[PDB]
Amino acid sequence: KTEWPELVGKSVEEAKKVILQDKPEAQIIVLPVGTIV
Amino acid sequence: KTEWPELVGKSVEEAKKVILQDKPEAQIIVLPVGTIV
Amino acid sequence: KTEWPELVGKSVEEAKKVILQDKPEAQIIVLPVGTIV
């Protein structure tokens, strides 16, 4: 499970709750769109 | 219906209401002009 | 001890407390992800 296309448009909270369900060890990083990585 | 030229200059609210009428499944993303995509 | 991979996802406070334990002379700099260095 490496991607969540179904999360586009949902809030950070909803997204956090979905990813932690599928990937309990996830380290969630929240950045502004356009942040150069 | 892939573009809304008639929405230039209108507020985000007005724009949201117009697009959802024409495209009920739209996932609306609001970014600052100039955000590098 | 030049890196702390175990700190990804933790808060700045927790991170500060961990690094100072391992490296008492550390000068801690806190920047936004994407700051061009």
Binding site: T2, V8, G9, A15 | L31 | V8
Partner: peptide
Amino acid sequence: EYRIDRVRLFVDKLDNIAQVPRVG
């Protein structure tokens, strides 16, 4: 650095997910 346990969320001005989240 590819980190198998990290998930970056790129948010819009209203904090909605703007792009498809992926591990890395």
